[PDB]
Symmetry: D2
Subunit: 237 residues, 4 copies
Amino acid sequence: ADTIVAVELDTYPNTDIGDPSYPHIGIDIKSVRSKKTAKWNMQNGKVGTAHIIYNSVDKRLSAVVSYPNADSATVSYDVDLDNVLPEWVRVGLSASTGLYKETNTILSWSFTSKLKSNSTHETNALHFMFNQFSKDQKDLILQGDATTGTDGNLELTRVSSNGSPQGSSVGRALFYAPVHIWESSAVVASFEATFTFLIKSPDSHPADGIAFFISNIDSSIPSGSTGRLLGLFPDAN
Amino acid sequence: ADTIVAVELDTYPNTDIGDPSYPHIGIDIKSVRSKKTAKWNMQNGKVGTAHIIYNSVDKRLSAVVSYPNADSATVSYDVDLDNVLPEWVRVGLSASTGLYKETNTILSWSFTSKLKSNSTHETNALHFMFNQFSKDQKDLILQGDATTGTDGNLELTRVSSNGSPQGSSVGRALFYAPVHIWESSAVVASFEATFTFLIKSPDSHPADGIAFFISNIDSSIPSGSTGRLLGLFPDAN
Amino acid sequence: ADTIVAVELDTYPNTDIGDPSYPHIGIDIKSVRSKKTAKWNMQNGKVGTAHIIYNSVDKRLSAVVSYPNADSATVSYDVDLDNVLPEWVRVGLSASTGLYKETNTILSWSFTSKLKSNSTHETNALHFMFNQFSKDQKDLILQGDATTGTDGNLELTRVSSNGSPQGSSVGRALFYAPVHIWESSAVVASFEATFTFLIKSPDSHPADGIAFFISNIDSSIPSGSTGRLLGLFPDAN
Amino acid sequence: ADTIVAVELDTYPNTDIGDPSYPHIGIDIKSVRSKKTAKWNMQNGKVGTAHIIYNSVDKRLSAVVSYPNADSATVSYDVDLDNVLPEWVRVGLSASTGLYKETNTILSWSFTSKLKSNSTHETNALHFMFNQFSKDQKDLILQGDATTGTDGNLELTRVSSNGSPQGSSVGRALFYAPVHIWESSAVVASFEATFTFLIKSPDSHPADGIAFFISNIDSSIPSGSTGRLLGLFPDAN
Ligand SMILES: [Ca+2]
Ligand SMILES: [Ca+2]
Ligand SMILES: [Ca+2]
Ligand SMILES: [Ca+2]
Ligand code: NI
Ligand code: NI
Ligand code: NI
Ligand code: NI
């Protein structure tokens, strides 16, 4: 199966798979059953921003999510990602809907990864920044229902022509280039990711959420991973 | 055929295809017969650095090459690259040898591309930086004789186990992700590239050179493009 | 006197000092009488963005200004800034009003300068980015009527408590650190600046404009440089 | 007195002020008596590199030091720097000698600080990179015996014309602009610093070391802070 590390922005509480009884941000290490969560005061129809950070010295995966005019939510988990993920990965965004639904619109996405070796200084890096997405966005691998270019955004899940979100949808976008997160000469490896999103629903109970994830390079959407599985996991184990 | 824009570091003068009678730096727009050249005081066995810059406002492709302790060489050419290249490209390094030969060793390579739209501000970017190359460098597409990982470098052309360059060799390395160099909302597009290289030969007359190039995404080494064609062109037209 | 290079966003046509008969963007080299202008379809009350670029290989100062949903305006001028400016400079934003007036509100400002030497690679750089300005913004030198922190913005000229712009106002903001734009070992020097602005006026005829400028490090607002002189020049010569 | 946070590269063991009995890297929070140390296999006459990282989510100050061909040393300490340092700081490098001595030569220094607010995204940043230092390096505040420009380097402590280090020397270099490390709207604040150094001594017992430090903006060298006090502290408390 794939290997997944993710930060979930989980809009729907599924208490039988360990969700708390409220929308939450969570750190997912090879399971949808988050290793750590924090309450997230999700705002339907507002643009929010998520930040994810990690480095190999501290071995702590941390995330922060906020909206304008509001306090932030944060979660952290101690994990050595070199013991979870392969040396080469892809990075992506995933989202889903089920019988409950929402738009999962990405307005911007940036990522920076650095590997500093013991040669003088000496730095290896990848950075990308999307503030618009066009119809044929050749540096993204789109999976499932994901599309680019409508209002210049990345729509991870299906939206009707009128703009209404659809249920039973899953989609992902992965950056085209593989990312090197460990190398034998590295003395420090780090990454940072940011994305801005708009989750809107006509309903009092939106579902299911958006995640930033890191995977094996050949990761694909698991069968049946609509809804609570966030397009990331094949089951709720 | 492919579409190629390149900056050549041309170590061998082929006067019947328009080279000046000395090693030179040149700007190549769809032909090995450079549109502009400048004299280049190439130093066998020393590490040099090349810089390439362009933006869509000025429409001027410029390059500078230098060694430590030495003066630089520079060349510029007025060209609207949106009239030459497709909207999506790959970027790469190429080198060749013929009956005359040299090592074509790359010690570092960086690239930055930016597309600024009329949305507030708003910036799209790709950056990469290699200061080492490992054996399985999954974010490079290696073509021909190119290899990575020997002494942590990118060897574009074949080198024997003892370190001696071989003749009749061609190789290229392209960054894995496609690069977006034009978009309909962009108000300014720019790129910059830098690479450090070591060209060494046991011979008084090294050949053939190294180039930084921009191509159609599916570019491959043309048949017969050893030697004076730099792994870039199918003929000398 | 000071030495000034500037890109003006000139909102009021002063035809006796060479302005065209419309709002314009211009390149000013030691004089308010621009060396080059282009028509600028200024939009009262909308947030716009300006970009300024230069490098020492091409010796061309270029600027672009745009609004969302609108075409851009651009201007370029061939000038070797090493023949105009000292080796160390400060960079800043300036604005003014006269008997006609406008707000001169800066929402964001970024700047990057690079000096690449002939040592391997080897790069020297300064970058800053402001997306908010607080009350005590210690890394800006504020001159004249400029203030920071109201609605998190930089107000270059005076605004009343109700938000109404005042006449006969001038103000500037300079980044605190001096900037090195020439060095004897540099093989390429470059800079880029971006700022986002909001010019609003209750009047059909706003005045006077906003400029990005580069000066001697000890530059101060010249006496009498309200209005058409943009806080930059002591006279209209 | 000043407020100092530093990462020390401590070349001389002063066991009565808590140094371990070997050269070490240490985290110093308002005292020379490090809160955490790690063994450092210092190599006389070789160029090394140090990296320092911190963010306000994790509240962990970490450092790594290495040489080419050698293993690294690392140290970390949990500290909320917003409870130690003021909101505005300067950043610097310091070094000293006493009756034992060494050169304290800086070949390169980079720094990046970021403040991400809850406005969309939205980022504030400062970055600088020095890979050479010239005679009149106007963006550095030099204190004590520090000089710039000899062989294009920053010599923090006194070196004779022949290149021999002198005893009883102290010197510092601070970046000219103040740095904003906390702001009330920030959701994440981070910094990273890197420097490359050459510590050489004719002696079997070099002293005293080099530190990267963060201070109140008006920090000056304390009286009597040669030798074991690293130009940072007024006493050994
Ligand atoms: Ca859930
Ligand atoms: Ca040739
Ligand atoms: Ca005017
Ligand atoms: Ca000591
Ligand atoms: Ni959950
Ligand atoms: Ni040629
Ligand atoms: Ni004008
Ligand atoms: Ni110590």
